[PDB]
Amino acid sequence: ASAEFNGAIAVVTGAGSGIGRACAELLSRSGANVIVADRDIEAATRVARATGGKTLVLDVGEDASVTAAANEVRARYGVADVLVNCAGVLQRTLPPGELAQREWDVVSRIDLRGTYLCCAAFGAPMADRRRGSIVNIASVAGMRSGPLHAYGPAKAGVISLTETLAGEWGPKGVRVNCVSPGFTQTPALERGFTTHTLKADVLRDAAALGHIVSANEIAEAVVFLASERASAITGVNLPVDAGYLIAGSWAAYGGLRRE
Amino acid sequence: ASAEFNGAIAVVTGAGSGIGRACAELLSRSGANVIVADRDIEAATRVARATGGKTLVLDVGEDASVTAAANEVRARYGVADVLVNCAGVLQRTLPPGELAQREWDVVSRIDLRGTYLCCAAFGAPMADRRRGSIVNIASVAGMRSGPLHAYGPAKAGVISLTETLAGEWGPKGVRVNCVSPGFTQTPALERGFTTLKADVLRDAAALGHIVSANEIAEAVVFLASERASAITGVNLPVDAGYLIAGSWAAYGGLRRE
Amino acid sequence: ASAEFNGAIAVVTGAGSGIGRACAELLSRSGANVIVADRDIEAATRVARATGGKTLVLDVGEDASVTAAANEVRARYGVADVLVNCAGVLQRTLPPGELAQREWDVVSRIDLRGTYLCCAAFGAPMADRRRGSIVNIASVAGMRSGPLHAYGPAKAGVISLTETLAGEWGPKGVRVNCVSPGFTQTPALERGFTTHTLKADVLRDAAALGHIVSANEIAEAVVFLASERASAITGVNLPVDAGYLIAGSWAAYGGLRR
Amino acid sequence: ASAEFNGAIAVVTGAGSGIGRACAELLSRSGANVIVADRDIEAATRVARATGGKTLVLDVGEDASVTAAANEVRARYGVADVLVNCAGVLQRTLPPGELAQREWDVVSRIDLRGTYLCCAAFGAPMADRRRGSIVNIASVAGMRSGPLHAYGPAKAGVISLTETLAGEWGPKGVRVNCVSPGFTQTPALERGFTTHTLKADVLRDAAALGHIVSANEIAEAVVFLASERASAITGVNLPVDAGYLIAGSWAAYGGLRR
Ligand SMILES: NC(=O)c1ccc[n+]([C@@H]2O[C@H](COP(=O)([O-])OP(=O)(O)OC[C@H]3O[C@@H](n4cnc5c(N)ncnc54)[C@H](O)[C@@H]3O)[C@@H](O)[C@H]2O)c1
Ligand SMILES: NC(=O)c1ccc[n+]([C@@H]2O[C@H](COP(=O)([O-])OP(=O)(O)OC[C@H]3O[C@@H](n4cnc5c(N)ncnc54)[C@H](O)[C@@H]3O)[C@@H](O)[C@H]2O)c1
Numbered sequence A: 001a002s003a004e005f006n007g008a009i010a011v012v013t014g015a016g017s018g019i020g021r022a023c024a025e026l027l028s029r030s031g032a033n034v035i036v037a038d039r040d041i042e043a044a045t046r047v048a049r050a051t052g053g054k055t056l057v058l059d060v061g062e063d064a065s066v067t068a069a070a071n072e073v074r075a076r077y078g079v080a081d082v083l084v085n086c087a088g089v090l091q092r093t094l095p096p097g098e099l100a101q102r103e104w105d106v107v108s109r110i111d112l113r114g115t116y117l118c119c120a121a122f123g124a125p126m127a128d129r130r131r132g133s134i135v136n137i138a139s140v141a142g143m144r145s146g147p148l149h150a151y152g153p154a155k156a157g158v159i160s161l162t163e164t165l166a167g168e169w170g171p172k173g174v175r176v177n178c179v180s181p182g183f184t185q186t187p188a189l190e191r192g193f194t195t196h197t198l199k200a201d202v203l204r205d206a207a208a209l210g211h212i213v214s215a216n217e218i219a220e221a222v223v224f225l226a227s228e229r230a231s232a233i234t235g236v237n238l239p240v241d242a243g244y245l246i247a248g249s250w251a252a253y254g255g256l257r258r259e
Numbered sequence B: 001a002s003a004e005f006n007g008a009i010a011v012v013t014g015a016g017s018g019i020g021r022a023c024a025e026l027l028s029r030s031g032a033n034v035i036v037a038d039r040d041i042e043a044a045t046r047v048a049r050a051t052g053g054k055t056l057v058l059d060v061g062e063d064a065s066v067t068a069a070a071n072e073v074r075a076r077y078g079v080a081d082v083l084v085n086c087a088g089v090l091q092r093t094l095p096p097g098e099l100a101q102r103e104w105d106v107v108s109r110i111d112l113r114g115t116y117l118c119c120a121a122f123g124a125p126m127a128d129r130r131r132g133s134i135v136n137i138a139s140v141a142g143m144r145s146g147p148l149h150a151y152g153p154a155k156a157g158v159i160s161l162t163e164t165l166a167g168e169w170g171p172k173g174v175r176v177n178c179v180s181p182g183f184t185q186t187p188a189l190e191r192g193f194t195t196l197k198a199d200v201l202r203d204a205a206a207l208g209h210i211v212s213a214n215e216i217a218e219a220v221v222f223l224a225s226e227r228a229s230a231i232t233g234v235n236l237p238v239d240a241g242y243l244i245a246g247s248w249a250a251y252g253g254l255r256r257e
Numbered sequence C, D: 001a002s003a004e005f006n007g008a009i010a011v012v013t014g015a016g017s018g019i020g021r022a023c024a025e026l027l028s029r030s031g032a033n034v035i036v037a038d039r040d041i042e043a044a045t046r047v048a049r050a051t052g053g054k055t056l057v058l059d060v061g062e063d064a065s066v067t068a069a070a071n072e073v074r075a076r077y078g079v080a081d082v083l084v085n086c087a088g089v090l091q092r093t094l095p096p097g098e099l100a101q102r103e104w105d106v107v108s109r110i111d112l113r114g115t116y117l118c119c120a121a122f123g124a125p126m127a128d129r130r131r132g133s134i135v136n137i138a139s140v141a142g143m144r145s146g147p148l149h150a151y152g153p154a155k156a157g158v159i160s161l162t163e164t165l166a167g168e169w170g171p172k173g174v175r176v177n178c179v180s181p182g183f184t185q186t187p188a189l190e191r192g193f194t195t196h197t198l199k200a201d202v203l204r205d206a207a208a209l210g211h212i213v214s215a216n217e218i219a220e221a222v223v224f225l226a227s228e229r230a231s232a233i234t235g236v237n238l239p240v241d242a243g244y245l246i247a248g249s250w251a252a253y254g255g256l257r258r
């Protein structure tokens, strides 16, 4: 535990599960007053009870929901000091034509547009106040090819939006960065194992360190960038991926040189 | 003029103006049978008359329009050999909160989703046929910071989608690449001068030029052609050195004449 | 039919073999007056006889050789219109400690420093004359991880130097770009097969298009960038790799769908 | 507390001044046993008196110096747990031809080759023991164009080498990452002000946050990556630049909105 965020209001979207839960837990253990924001109130309530945080009902796919949630935070607590955008959904890894356009649309709406909605609603007041730190959650899938024709582009959009906002709000004292997880142990990744969409040993083999990343490891990088340890860092994308991005190019040379 | 695309069916979206028009002109001068596709039927027809191409009514923001256009092409001409995705719109350069969410949505719908709609509708038949070349139009704005919180992310999405498709369809023999224009002289840029200042754009590029639509088209046509037979999944900036020049300010700026 | 150079003077380093040979051949077929430059005069002569170009002895690891070559070009032909830096060497794919420091030093000296030597010697006069186009040869190995602790860094150095020079000389009308080949069929790649450092089917499998790149395919990209068809392109790195950079990230999803 | 190292041995090169000094200081405050390594014993002694660390004479431009220093660390303390490569030099911002080749060579030898020498000498034993964390210092100048035809390429080389080593040694449990500072307040930057090579207000204006980066701010990112809080991070380049990389592209739109 630490006092690094004592007094800080930290809104974490998607905080009921996975990466957002781990960020909420670490921010709370670091002293922050965490707003546990999720569309799933049961999950958010469980996390808030464990962290001492406060729940906020938030559907990032619904403009009215985001606007209302932002107004509730301002009225009840104050201008957010930290915003972490973890709400997101995955997609089936289907090629164009097999992937339903409806599925493509949902991924874009939640993962890119929903992050924009929250940055605008929670972050514009930060720029007005002249202080704040925003951390978005992108993905290695936003950085390289893969069978994710909605999720890849949406996460690449998050990397871009992190850069555009960092330039817009830098002169107003707000830092905006993003973390790009590799394959991270969460209930979403477990559902991929259950549908046989992914295989755990295949994911380990695809990473230079031979590990699947833990939600807590992602949260450490988010909290670093959200904190004053990162006071000079803005507009960056930090991959936390156990070396996934490193390993793929070794196959032409016979693969990683393993134990 | 050349025969490099003799016999090829080349669908160009947004071909009524600007970059798409220059691509249609150069593809036609290179021998292709150009399908001049646009939401603006009068503009498409002017370009088709000049190029010997054929018009195709296409609104990349309407799924039914894209599906019908792809079906017309397949029945009247055949499977496309080349698809160039130039249809697109710009946005007002407003910060979050000032930019209307409706404006953000339109840009994402046309510039990213509309390119996906056309890649799926025209490009899946290419993958089934085991040959084709697709060139998307991104932007330097998809590569660096700027005051375009819809357009930047959408164009970054185009760069990503070019990569994801190149991997999906590489084993089926379809190459997918993208060109990222800098500031390019088109009627859309002229509307910016009447938001943007021409001297400022020249100063922001290492070569001191605004890119012409024809210069963009040369890069598109290179990537679409067999001169690029081993090139897939790449983003080619055609920007007069905009991406190069910004980092010089800390050292006193470009060292000019 | 790829471009027209109208007699432009084009100096190609490493032009006796592989990528440089293919660049010299296509430039000559495209109307350029090619200067076939190489450390191996016998290989340069063979290529120059086939291209109608002229030979130039050039060892990019020897400062005096680069200076003397630039002086010969200036006196005999004039300032170059095009420079293509293809001279290069590979390395054994050994981890640090197994890799001899002497091997590391050679690769850095030839592949990065030697390209800098030629850009300074042949390219500064281009900037003085307010025109020219320079194409460097980097590699996908300068863009991603691999067992190449000298060659990767040197080729990443070439990508950077392309950007730095593009900015220095952009205002003087000189474009500077680079091509990053993937695995390309040359005698240097053949030595990787013979020594069993590389396996041809493994290289095809590692590319989204399932091919090894040909030297001519690299030359087409070099010639495009060197030509007026690329008059607005500067400071860019163009990968020509059959989709090597694309394919590696698919393994986590079960690999390429073949 | 930024991190806890529990007595881990941390070798910091260039630790007598600037970024290396700040890294040594924060590592010591975070519980590491710091080895303050520098070519200048006087500066290293001053830093080590403040950190309780131990001094090591190290010239990263002399192979025998690096080898002897690694042997002394192994003999006196053990295999390093952490290595931070901060030894470096800048260059005059001159175009090719005006920049002496001797100046180009020094920058490449110290900034890229010297980092490779240290990664090989101190890092191969880490891979052998199956544990360690290495942080290299690159620069934003290794990521974008500028008037730095040696320093840009050398620092791009460091970003590459970080990736190549991360792949080589990842399977042996060693993480390798790098930090790319922007303009950072050190004696080296002050020499740029004194020579009027740089102007402080120009550097602030070129960053989205309007600041010059402090040496301590760089050290925080180095210590995060070196620590177990970054146990899943390898092969990455983390810019710490107050938004320099963000700001340049705004000029076309009228500049930053201040
Ligand atoms: N798990 C991975 O391997 C991985 C990898 C890369 C990126 N990511 C990204 O990290 C973030 C979280 O991933 P996760 O693994 O923690 O998934 P998760 O399913 O375990 O948690 C996601 C949370 O987001 C909430 N949520 C979903 N849609 C929402 C909506 N419209 N409005 C509000 N809340 C919504 C969910 O209720 C859920 O609690 C996502 O952006 C994900 O794309 C995850
Ligand atoms: N001009 C530049 O500086 C510049 C820079 C970077 C990127 N781009 C991109 O190049 C592409 C073309 O730009 P331009 O300068 O030629 O603009 P332009 O206005 O001159 O031409 C754009 C064409 O797209 C058509 N179009 C717009 N929406 C459409 C829709 N839903 N369906 C079908 N057609 C539609 C328009 O009718 C028009 O004919 C765009 O993607 C643009 O974002 C332009």
Ligand SMILES: NC(=O)c1ccc[n+]([C@@H]2O[C@H](COP(=O)([O-])OP(=O)(O)OC[C@H]3O[C@@H](n4cnc5c(N)ncnc54)[C@H](O)[C@@H]3O)[C@@H](O)[C@H]2O)c1
Pocket: C013, C014, C015, C016, C017, C018, C019, C020, C037, C038, C039, C040, C043, C058, C059, C060, C061, C062, C085, C086, C087, C088, C089, C090, C110, C111, C114, C137, C138, C139, C140, C180, C181, C182, C183, C184, C185, C186, C187, C188, C189
């Ligand atoms: N073949 C590939 O797969 C591949 C991949 C990526 C990059 N590259 C790069 O392409 C360029 C050409 O490679 P290649 O495959 O054609 O090799 P190659 O052996 O077929 O030809 C290389 C030429 O460079 C000459 N040369 C070597 N050192 C020289 C020196 N100091 N001075 C003058 N000439 C010298 C050689 O005599 C030879 O003629 C190199 O830079 C290489 O690193 C090659």
Ligand SMILES: NC(=O)c1ccc[n+]([C@@H]2O[C@H](COP(=O)([O-])OP(=O)(O)OC[C@H]3O[C@@H](n4cnc5c(N)ncnc54)[C@H](O)[C@@H]3O)[C@@H](O)[C@H]2O)c1
Pocket: D013, D014, D015, D016, D017, D018, D019, D020, D037, D038, D039, D040, D043, D058, D059, D060, D061, D062, D085, D086, D087, D088, D089, D090, D110, D111, D114, D137, D138, D139, D140, D180, D181, D182, D183, D184, D185, D186, D187, D188, D189
């Ligand atoms: N200051 C900046 O703005 C900035 C920006 C980007 C990157 N960097 C990089 O950070 C690192 C340190 O920069 P700094 O500002 O702290 O410089 P500095 O002059 O303040 O300190 C550098 C230290 O490196 C030592 N050193 C130099 N050459 C050496 C050699 N052969 N062997 C051993 N020690 C040697 C010096 O004795 C000195 O103590 C460098 O790699 C630099 O390139 C600095």
